[PDB]
Every structure is written in C-alpha cells, then in structure tokens.
C-alpha cells in the first residue's frame, strides 16, 4: 500500500549507530585490531602499564596480544561455553642486583568478546552490560547546610581510586580537612608540602579574617619533615611513626599515581574549574625528595575567594549532566581488570621473596588464577551484567542503551532519594524523560536519548545546528551540558523559509529556562524532536497528545511485545521503525550489489558483482532467553536483482523491514455488557480463526545422568513398572522421538537411579514376595513434563562423557536436552496493549455473529471501553484510530512524526476521501440509506453531532469526519443508539500470558529447616500467606481458618499428614497440633543459651517434644 | 549439611562459625597444657571471645566474620531470629500454605455477587484429596491409590472425573486474595463456578475493595478445609455479607464505571 508521510521538519543528520555505546566502548578497551606499538595508553593497555614494573629484582611488561576465539558464537551457545579469546602477555624479568634477563610470554586466561550487536555470550547465555551513571571525578564546592554562610569543598576521585576529601571551615576559624571520615586542621598538611606562613599570607591574605584564621603558630615551629611525622600520628595511632613508613602512607594516599586516580575527566574538570593545568592525575607529587603540591592550594584558594563573593566563583550543581558522567562497558570491565592485575602482582612480590633469587623465569613467577577469577567474577555476578532481554529485537536494543545509577559503585535501592531521581534540566537531549521504571527504581534506571552519544571522557553529548545571523548552517555540534549552557538554542520546529529563520520571535532555551527571543540572538537550534526521547518513546505516534505517565507505559510495553507469526508494522508509524530493525541486526541485508542466485527456507545464496557466491544461512526457530522464537524468513526470490543494503530476510517481529510488534485490528470504542469493565478487553473469535495474535514458544528441558556412590544413573528406555502405552513415543535409548506431542505427566527422558539403603522396608518385602517380583535394583527417576507445560518435541541434544569434544562437570556421565515448542493462540487471560499505554487482559472472545458490525457486514475485531480514556489522558490512541479508519478504506498506511505530525485538518481531508469509498460504492451497487441509519441520525442531531436539515449522506459524512460510524449490534440487529468511533489500531500481545501464570497446589515440596511449603511455580510452591493476610483473617475473626493456615496447611507435620488421610477417608480433618517452625524457634533460643518453657495453668512445664529431647 | 540434586553439598553458615569456635577452644586447651607465655595465652583467649561473639551475633561487635573470598557476612543466630527475613516475621507470623493457587483475573459480569470463575484445572488440584474420595465412592477408580495415579497423566483423565469434581465442591467456598491486603476485604469468600480456561473470573462489584483492575492483576486462591473453616468463610467472610466499609460504615460494594454510566 501507499505510504504518506507528514511533517515539514528536515532532519540534517540521521540517528547515530544505536548500539555504538556498547560496540565502541569495548573496542576502545581491547584495541585488538591495533598493532601493539601503536596502542594508546587507555583501557587494557593502560591497566597493564599501571601495574608494571613490579619492584623487589624487577618484572617488566612488554606488550599483550589477543588470540582468535577457540569456538564460534553459535558453538558457544550450543555447548554452554563462554565466547572469549586467549590473552597472552610478553614479560621481561630483570635483576636489579645482577644483570640477568629472561623474557617469556605467559598465558593469562581468556577474555570475553562482544558480538556484532553489542552483547556477550557467557556460559551459553547471552548477556548485556548496562552502563552506570555516577559522579564525575573533580573538585566540587557545595553550600554547607549547617552554617548559612560557609561552604564545603569536596575533592572526589574515580571510584575506589582514592578517598573522599572534605574541606569544612570550623566555627573556630581554622580551615579543616576531612579524610576517611577523620578531621584535623588543614594547615598541618600544608606545612608538609613545604609551604611557609608568607606564602599563605601573600597568596591569599586578601581575605582579612579567613587567611589569618588558618594560621597556627605551633605547626610552623617545625621543618616539613617534622610536620609529616606529626600528622601521621593523628591518622594511625599506635603505629610507630617511622620516617620511611610515614612517607609511604602519605605518598600512597595522596601522591601515588597507582593508588590515587583522579579521572581524565577529573583532570579536565579540575584544570578547567580552578584555572590551572595538571601534570597528572594525583593531588600531589614526590619530587626532589620532598612533597610538592598540585591541587590543594588552588582548591583552598577557590574556597576562600568564594566565601567572600569574588566574581567568577560559583557553587556546583551535582545533578547537572556536566558533573555527572557515564561508565560504559569498557570502563566497567577495565576497572575489574585492574583489580585482577593487582592481585596477581601480590603473588609476584610474594614469589620473589622465596624460592631462590635466580632460578625463576616469568612463567613460574606468574599465577594467572587471580586474574581469570576477577574477570569471570565481573561477567557472571556483577549487578550490571544482566540476562539479555531478547523478547523481541527492540527489547535487546533498548537493554543495551539503558543507564543504571544502581550497582557496584553506586546507590543502594534503600540508599537513594529525590534529588537523583528527578528529571534535571540538562537531561534535555541526553537521557529520556519518559522511559524509566515505575516503582521503587523510578529515576535510577533510564535510557539514552536517540541522538545522544557518550564522549571519551564519559559525558553525554547531544547535537545542535549552528545559526549565524539568521541563517541556519548544516554544521552540527555535539555539546556537553556545560558547554550547551553558554548559548541561546532555538526550537527545532521554528519556521524557516529556505535556510533562513522566517519568524520575528522564536522559541528558545537559555540554561533550560524557556525564553522568547528575536532571530538576531539565536546561536544554535535543535536538530529534531526525536533527540529529546529514547528509542521506545520515539515509536509512539501522536505522542504530543499523550499524558506522560501513560506514554511511559507505552514505551516500556513495546519492550514486552511477543513476536507473532503474522506480525505487521503499524498503519500509523513515526518513521523510526525502519531504523530499529536495521540496527537491531535481526534482519538480513545485501553486502554489495548483485543477483539472487538461490532462495531456500534454510538459506539464501547471492551472486555479487565481485563474482563471489556469498551464502547467507538463515536462523530458523531459535529459542531466545525469554522463550520467544527468533526466526528469519526469506524475502527475495530466485533471480531477484538487489542493490547494496537491500533486505534479504525478515527477522522476528519485522514485516518487510519495518518493526512489527503487534497487529493492526479494526477496533470499536464502546462499553460491551460489562466484559469491558476496568480495562478488560473483548475480542472477536475471528482473530483466532485467522491466527492473529498467535505466537510460537519453546521451553528447554535438561537432565543429567551422573555417577553416584550407589552406582551410575542411566538414561534408558527400560523403566520399572511402566506400561508400553507410557513409553510409545520414546526411542530405543529412552529419549522421546522427535515430532511427538507431549502433555503433562509424560516421560521426556527415561532415567534410572540406584535405590538407597531404604532397601525396601519389610512392609514392601512381604508385598513383593506375594507377586513374585524381585524389588528392582533401580528406581524410576525419569524426566517428566511439568504440570501445565508441553508441546511438540522439535529437538533433542544428547551429550555423554567420552564422546568427541565433550567433558562435563566432574561426576556427570551424560546430559540430555529436549527442546519442546508450542503454538500459542490468543486466549482469555492473555494481555494486550497499544503504544499509548492502554493495556488490558482479554476477558471475552465472542463468536463473529455477536460482534458489532458496520452496515456493509464487516465485523469489528477488538472492543475497547471508552472509560479508559478520560482519566488516563492518553489521546494519541484516539487520533490513531481515526487516521486508521481513513487508511482502512483508502488502503494506505501513514508516517506521522512525533511533534511534527499529521494534524487535525489533514486527517479530516483523508477521512472525507475514505467516506466516498465506504458510501459511493453502496449508491452505485443499488442501495439507499437504511431505516436504522435514520434512527441513529435522529439521535445524532439531538446530540449536536450533525446539522439539522441535510440529506442522510451529508450527515453520515459529517459523522465520518468525526470518526464515528453507525454500528449494528449483532445480537439484535438493531443499531447502537449512537454513532460509535471505529478505526484501525496497532495492538500488541504482551509477554504476560495465563498459560505461564496459572498455578495450584494441594500438597508438595517442603523447606528443610522450617518444614513449610516451598515457594514459586517451578518448585510446585504454596502461596505465601503473609503477615498482612493473617491480619485480614484476624479482623474477620475467622480463628479456625487462620489456624488451618498456621498448622494443617503448613508445617504442622503430624496434623498435615493426618488431615490428608482424613480427606481421602472421607473423615473430617483433625484438630491441629504444634507447628514445627515453633519447635525450631525454641531450639534456636536454646542455642543462644536462653531457656524457653511452655507452662500449664499450674505453672508446670509442658513438653512439646513428647519426650524426645530429654534424657 | 544436605546433598543437593547434583551430588554437591550445601551447608548452613552455622557450621563454619562453630568450626572456628571449636578449633580455637581446642588450640587453647593444648596451649594451656603446654605452658605458653601469657601474651600467647592472652591472644588465644581474646580470639576465643571474638569467635563466640560471631557465632551468637555476627557483626554486632567488630568486623563481620566472612567466608573466604566473599563479602557476605556469615549468618549467625541473631540474624536468624530477627529482621524481615528472620524467623518471626517469615515463618512464624506468616507461612506458605498448601491448598492454594494463583492466576490472572478476568471480569465476570454474569456472576452473582457471591460467585467466582475458577479454572477447572486449578480446582482439581486444590480439591485433589476430596476428588480421590469421591472417585472411590462412585466408581471412576477402584481405590484411592489408583485414582491418584490416573490424574498424574493429563491424557489419562476421563470426562467423568470433571462431573465427579462438581459433586465435591457443592456449597463450599474458596478464598480470593489480591495483594496488597490493606484491610480485611483483601480476602473474601466465593462459591466457585468451574470454567474452562486458565483465568480466574472476578465479580465486578468487588473490584474496588480489592483495588483490582484487568490490566493484568493476578489473585491467589485458598481452600478452607474443615467444616469450621467453611462455616467461618460462608458466614463471616462471604462477599455478599460484607457490603459496607468497616472504616466509614458506607457502602463498599456499590455501582462504579459502566454500571453508573448505564443507569
């Protein structure tokens, strides 16, 4: 169909590469494609250069190299392996005593490689590393809350690379320094730097009472060496103040470019703020035998000058996005790399003080175990290493662009409050104001803005066009937040004639504050409205019409869209749905120009101009992390002529290259007999008939057969006491055959385990003797289908020990994996939503004959209740429906950009053209106006909808332009007493499906210590009847119901056993006994040496252990 | 000390705290018999106190005792007793329970105020002991053991078993709960109406007291077992007998949304 695009905004630059924040970050850290001599000192290289040389003997670093991966990505996912490269390092051993030189390349283990789309494979599972927002290193000055006229100067370095410093000025008048939460007068440290009373007087003095208030005579009565010993006694009481020891502590804490690291951004921020230039990343130096200051005096100078009110001195806003920076994957991993390297160095110094100071090479001196563990530890247990969200292509693309303020080196979930969660004025163009979690994490986890990119220092920059005079150039400037605040920036929609600003008054921002300004004052201009929002938010058409709280749900829920077999792109798009499929990498494109040689279900072969016959295999039915089917389908035919970058195969949830998260359905907005109540949704059985909202899902089942002290577990088709009916679909070896339908209770893989010393009780012995069947040596442990699961067996993987390429964890003979697939039709309880935040559960599926229908016989698809609109204030769905109506009859789809979109008059023009097809057809087909259409028209003029005194055609068109039509109730045939809004809406089936959530338990697994039911569906858990539920039962006074919850239905063991026996015998359940978790409590108080005694009315003890615990 | 599935061992932190204690006591007994100087005997004695301190309340005084190569403080007896995760507020004032289930809720306009839609598959598990007895009284299985064996495989379930379940639940109620339970109406009693399908059907009038939507809410189900529990539920906890707020005294089950709109 034709695609009509609205909007006048010409976007001078395309969206940047969307995963670049990931791909570019790690490439920068590894520099694997850089020749070692050409590596810059950054990332991994910088980490090595920092740890070495290791002094005693000296072990020095030459260079590192990265090998090729031992196994490809597909193989790693298959075998539950990490996708990684071997790391080697060239080291030269030197002898400071001798002259001896031995050089060798030591193996440091493997390092994980990032895939093409910006993710990782760690033990077979795909993972994402989320960027972390935090405070930029530097020197900040904030107002002191206690004293309204004084300030605290805080010197903050990179995390874990030094202490926090506070320079509070105490009430006594002397300037105090705070380090590791301990305070002393700052003057003493100044003396250690070699400063004299003259310097402080001559440098500052201008401030009458402050410079003199720092002056303390007793400190001056000693040369720089004596003052250093004096301070050390303050910081480490009881440690002998040996002169080499004091120097060592102070050097390592302040001046050591190994133990103290300001950022590279810290250096720039410090240099820029204090107007000095730093020779390095440390607060001081050790030069020519004494300490020489760098930072401290300028920080003191700025503080005093600020207290007075000297021009050029300001406090810093700590939530400003100039003083807040992003830590990306390379930086996060490199920090952990630096930790592992330092641990390995501990082993080196310790090994260089033992086994002979001569017969040692670098290979024996280095143990790589500490390094491998630190890297393996980060990629498997960090709280920035997350299970990939790959529900649909947008899920993972969004996941990679997320920003967390949580994690190792950031706030706790308890340790966080409003200032940080706020939307800062500087978030404009950088962090999306919409896409954030609702609930406890609000404002901490956010999403990178669409046009934003993170610079080398870690600050987010956003693009603007230069405006010189009144002419707008095509030169784009990416600005940090601090640099943006300097200029006056006009809005992107401000009128233009050609390249000239066409308005006398323009809408602009100066430091985020909106201001009206003349074109002479305009320095820059926004690139686009898209630059303000995340990628998910940019997919919501008519966003300018949606209340933000609902727009949020629209964004977040697109993440949850399940790939549909019939998936289609929305009829109203924003124009970003093309870019998302391409950057996601789900879809397949042509490398060069060429001709399609072959097209298959499994593969596509292309003959290019080069003559090379490149073959592109297609991924078919692969199971994602969330169990949605990732599957690619061929879009070209044999012999099709393709140009460079043209589509070859569609990925999942994509249709001809446009993002398809759902389906386009014909919707009627109206209550329906209470099946619409409180956001529930009514659907036509026609949707299932034509397989709309059907999606494929695969669950993986796994079982190990291992060696035990009682003998081997064996995976076998021979399982004790089972009929052949119970085994039919199992192969020779005991594995279910590929292409079988399996249902709950069915055997997937047969397995036997050797019976314990429970070697049958005499009760079983006598029974076994009667039937004349020996009690078997093995018991039936077979893997079965869980309750509520099942499908078609599409695959089996079997891995034994002693087969090429496989070694399992010790003791495990063999592992069998069964992949089971299911086609899921939409059903009652599955959840639907649109892009505006209207979301609901399917409450009713009507047969087509009950559905409200148009006069010409077409039934509607979805019936949505209007009561969801007015309180929610999400109106984009309404305009979306109307334009959807026009497109339904005109046969077209639209691109309506956000904030530069289809507007009301234009939608009206289109709606009129549609009416002609809906009506003119009828008049020519030989039908006039219906009797019921008149009845509705009567009611409509009473409503002021149509003008009285016009032909029925004129009035129906008047309604059709209001997006309303006549609707007949399929039950009665009588019309709805009013004209109803009807049109095409884009609605997605979300990942929350009843099939997954329905659960029930009579009895089941219990916990070890408490003897209470386990939790969770996978464990066959019981529901938690918690503290608040008990209150409810208490307020009702239901004592026996509550007691049942507290005894027979939980840990009262005698009672729960006895109650079950009663129900199966038809007797009533017995009165409960003492709950076992109370006995646990008693013994636990005894373990704390407290005597807990149950007493009767005579104050005599009652034994709740029934004699078992007394000798 | 338990062997998990894989043959691996999983163990309580208390064992490591006791082991530390036992070692230091034993070494102290040995150092005393061997007549070590007072400085050495003193160090051993103070280490012994600290070991006792970690066992009873770890972290209370001094550095928390940790397992090697982990930052996790070991869990001592005080930690076991106290806190949100402690013995009292987890296993004592509240518990997980048998005879309970959960699913997504869906609106049921056709229900009478005292009714709910209950998926048939959920009902069979919740009443499973009752269903076995009834399957013996009539005739679907020879005895209780064979009846249970038949429900294990879903294809072995014949259609008479569903009618059998209908006889079981006659006149009985179940409890519906939707979290958070802010006041006593987060739980109400309903007579279940068996339904095909995986969703719980909730009566429209009670959605307010429950603060329920159909935006995807789920609810928990509970089965009162005894005659006493059933009596308490049907009389005291039944939705139809609680129509007015205990807080304001005003009507709680009252028209809203479409109902008001229609009238």
């Amino acid at each position: 169909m034709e695609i009509k695009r609205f909007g006048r905004i010409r976007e001078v630059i395309p969206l940047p590469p969307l995963t670049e924040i990931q791909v570019e970050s790690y490439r920068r850290a590894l520099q694997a494609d850089v020749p070692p001599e050409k590596r810059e000192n950054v990332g991994i290289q910088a980490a090595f250069r920092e740890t070495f040389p290791i002094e005693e003997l000296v072990l020095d670093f030459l260079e590192y190299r990265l090998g090729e991966p031992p196994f490809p990505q597909d193989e790693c996912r298959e075998k539950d392996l990490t996708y990684q490269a071997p790391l080697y390092a060239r080291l030269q051993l030197i002898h400071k005593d001798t002259g001896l030189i031995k050089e060798d390349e030591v193996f440091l283990g493997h390092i994980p490689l990032m895939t093409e789309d910006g993710s990782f494979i760690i033990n077979g599972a795909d993972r994402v590393i989320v960027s972390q927002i935090h405070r930029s290193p530097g020197v900040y000055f904030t107002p002191d809350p206690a004293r309204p006229g004084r300030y605290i100067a805080s010197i903050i370095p990179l995390p874990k690379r030094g202490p926090w410093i506070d320079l509070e000025v105490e009430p006594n008048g002397v300037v105090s320094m705070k380090v590791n939460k301990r305070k002393f007068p700052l003057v003493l440290l100044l003396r250690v730097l070699g400063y004299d009373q003259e310097t402080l007087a001559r440098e500052l003095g201008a401030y009458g009472e402050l410079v003199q208030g720092l002056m303390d005579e007793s400190v001056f009565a000693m040369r720089p060496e004596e003052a250093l010993i004096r301070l050390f006694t303050l910081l480490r009481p009881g440690d002998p103040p040996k002169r080499d020891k004091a120097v060592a502590y102070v050097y390592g804490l302040i001046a050591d470019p190994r133990r103290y690291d300001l950022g590279e951004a810290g250096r720039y921020k410090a240099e820029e703020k204090l107007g000095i230039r730093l020779s390095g990343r440390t607060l001081a130096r050790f030069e020519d035998g004494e300490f020489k200051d760098e930072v401290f005096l300028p920080t003191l100078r700025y503080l005093f000058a600020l207290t007075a009110g000297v021009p050029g001195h300001e406090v810093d806003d700590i939530d400003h996005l100039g003083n807040r920076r992003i830590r990306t994957v390379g930086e996060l991993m490199t920090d952990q790399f630096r930790v592992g390297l330092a641990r390995l160095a501990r082993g080196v110094r310790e090994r260089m003080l033992m086994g002979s100071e001569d017969s040692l090479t670098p290979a024996k001196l280095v143990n790589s175990r500490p390094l491998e563990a630190a890297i393996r530890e980060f990629f498997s247990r960090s709280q920035l290493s997350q299970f990939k969200d790959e529900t649909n292509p947008l899920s993972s693309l969004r996941h990679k662009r997320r920003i967390s303020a949580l994690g190792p080196g950031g706030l706790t979930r308890e340790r966080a409050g409003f200032d940080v969660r706020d939307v800062h004025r500087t978030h404009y163009g950088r962090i999306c104001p919409v896409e954030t979690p609702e609930g406890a994490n609000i404002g901490l986890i956010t999403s990178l803005a669409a046009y934003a990119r993170v610079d080398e220092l870690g600050f987010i920059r956003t693009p603007y066009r230069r405006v010189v005079g009144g002419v707008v150039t095509d030169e784009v400037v990416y600005m940090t937040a601090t640099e943006e605040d300097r200029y006056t920036i006009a809005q992107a929609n401000t009128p233009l004639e050609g390249n000239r600003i066409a308005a006398e008054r323009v809408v602009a921002r100066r430091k985020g504050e909106p201001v009206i300004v003349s074109p002479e004052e305009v320095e820059f201009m926004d690139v686009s409205p898209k630059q303000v929002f995340s990628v998910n938010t940019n997919l919501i058409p008519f966003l300018e019409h949606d209340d933000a709280n609902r727009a949020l749900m629209g964004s977040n829920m697109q993440t949850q869209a399940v790939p549909l077999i019939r998936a289609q792109a929305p009829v109203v798009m924003t124009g970003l749905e093309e870019r998302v499929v391409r950057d996601s990498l789900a879809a397949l494109y042509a490398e060069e120009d060429g001709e399609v040689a072959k097209v298959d279900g499994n593969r596509i072969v292309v003959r290019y101009e080069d003559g090379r016959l490149v073959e592109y295999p297609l991924r078919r039915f692969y199971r994602s992390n969330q169990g949605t089917a990732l599957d690619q389908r061929p879009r070209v035919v044999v012999g099709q002529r393709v140009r460079k970058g043209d589509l070859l195969a569609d990925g999942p949830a994509s249709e001809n290259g446009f993002l398809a998260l759902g389906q386009n359905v014909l919707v009627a907005i109206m209550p329906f007999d209470g099946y619409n109540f409180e956001d529930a949704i009514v659907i036509s059985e026609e949707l299932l008939k034509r397989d709309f909202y059907t999606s494929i899902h695969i669950e993986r089942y796994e079982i190990e057969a291992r060696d035990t002290k009682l003998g081997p577990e064996r995976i076998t088709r021979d399982i004790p006491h089972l009929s052949e009916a119970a085994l039919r679909d199992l192969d020779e070896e005991g594995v279910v055959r590929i292409g079988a339908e399996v249902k709950p209770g069915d055997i997937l893989v047969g397995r036997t385990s050797f019976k314990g010393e429970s070697e049958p009780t005499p009760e079983e012995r006598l029974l076994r003797s009667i039937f004349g069947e020996k009690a078997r040596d093995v018991k039936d442990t077979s893997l079965r289908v869980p309750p509520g699961e099942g499908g078609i067996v599409v695959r089996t993987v079997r891995l034994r020990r002693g087969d090429p390429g496989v070694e399992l964890k010790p003791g495990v003979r063999e592992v069998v994996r069964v992949y089971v697939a299911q086609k899921r039709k939409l059903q009652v309880g599955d959840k639907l939503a649109n892009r505006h935040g209207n979301k609901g559960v399917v409450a009713k599926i009507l047969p087509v004959e009950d559905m409200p229908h148009l006069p010409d016989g077409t039934p509607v698809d979805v019936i949505l209740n209007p009561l969801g609109v007015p309180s929610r204030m999400n109106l984009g769905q309404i305009l979306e429906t109307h334009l959807g109506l026009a497109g339904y009859f005109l046969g077209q789809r639209y691109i309506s950009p956000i904030f530069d979109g289809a507007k009301e008059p234009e939608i009206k023009e289109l709606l009129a053209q549609a009416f002609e097809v809906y009506f003119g057809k009828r008049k020519g087909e030989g039908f006039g106006v219906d009797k019921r259409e008149v009845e509705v028209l009567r009611r409509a003029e009473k409503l002021g909808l149509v003008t009285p005194g016009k032909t029925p055609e004129e009035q129906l068109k008047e309604l059709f332009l209001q997006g309303k039509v006549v609707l007949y109730d399929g039950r009665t045939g009588e019309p709805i007493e009013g004209p109803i809004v009807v049109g095409q809406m884009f609605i997605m089936k979300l990942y929350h499906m009843v099939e997954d959530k329905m659960h029930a338990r009579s009895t089941g697994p219990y916990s070890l210590i408490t003897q209470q039911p386990l939790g969770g569906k996978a464990q066959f858990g019981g529901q938690r009847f918690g503290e608040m539920e008990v209150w409810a039962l208490e307020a009702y006074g239901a004592a026996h119901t509550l007691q049942e919850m507290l005894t027979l239905k939980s840990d009262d063991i005698e009672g729960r056993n006895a109650a079950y026996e009663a129900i199966i015998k038809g007797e009533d359940v017995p009165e409960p006994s003492v709950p076992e978790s109370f006995r646990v409590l008693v013994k636990e108080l005894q373990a704390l040496a407290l005597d807990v005694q149950t007493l009767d009315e005579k104050d005599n003890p009652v034994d709740i252990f029934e004699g078992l615990a007394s000798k | 000390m338990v062997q998990v599935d894989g043959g691996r061992f999983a163990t309580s932190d208390l064992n490591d705290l006791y082991r530390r204690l036992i070692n230091r006591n034993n070494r102290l007994k040995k150092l005393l018999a061997q007549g070590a100087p007072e400085i050495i005997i003193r160090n051993e004695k103070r280490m012994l106190q600290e070991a006792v301190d970690a066992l009873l309340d770890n972290g209370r005084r001094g550095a928390p005792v940790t397992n090697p190569g982990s930052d996790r403080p070991l869990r001592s007896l005080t930690d076991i007793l106290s806190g949100k995760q402690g013995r009292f507020r987890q296993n004592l004032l509240g518990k997980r329970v048998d005879y309970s289930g959960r699913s997504v809720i869906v609106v049921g306009p056709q229900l009478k105020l005292h009714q709910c839609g209950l998926p048939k598959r959920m009902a069979l598990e919740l009443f499973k002991p009752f269903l076995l007895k009834k399957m013996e009284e009539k005739g679907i299985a020879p005895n209780v053991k064979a009846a249970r064996r038949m429900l294990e495989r879903q294809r072995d379930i014949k259609d008479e078993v569903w009618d059998a379940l209908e006889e079981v639940i006659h006149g009985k109620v179940v409890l519906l709960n939707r979290a958070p339970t802010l006041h006593r109406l987060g739980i109400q009693a309903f007579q279940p109406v068996l339904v095909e399908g995986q969703s719980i059907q909730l009566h429209p009038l009670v959605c307010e007291a429950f603060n329920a939507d159909f935006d995807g809410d789920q609810m928990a189900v509970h089965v009162p077992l005894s005659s006493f529990a059933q009596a308490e539920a049907r009389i005291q906890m039944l939705s139809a007998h609680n129509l007015l707020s205990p807080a304001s005294g005003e009507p709680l089950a009252k028209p809203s949304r479409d109902i008001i709109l229609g009238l």
Binding site: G238, D239 | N43, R46, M47, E50, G62
Partner: peptide
C-alpha cells in the same frame, strides 16, 4: 579495637 593492632 583492632585485634591485630593490639597484638602487634
């Protein structure tokens, strides 16, 4: 307050 420091 630090058992190592005391012993040293």
């Amino acid at each position: 307050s630090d058992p190592v420091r005391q012993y040293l």
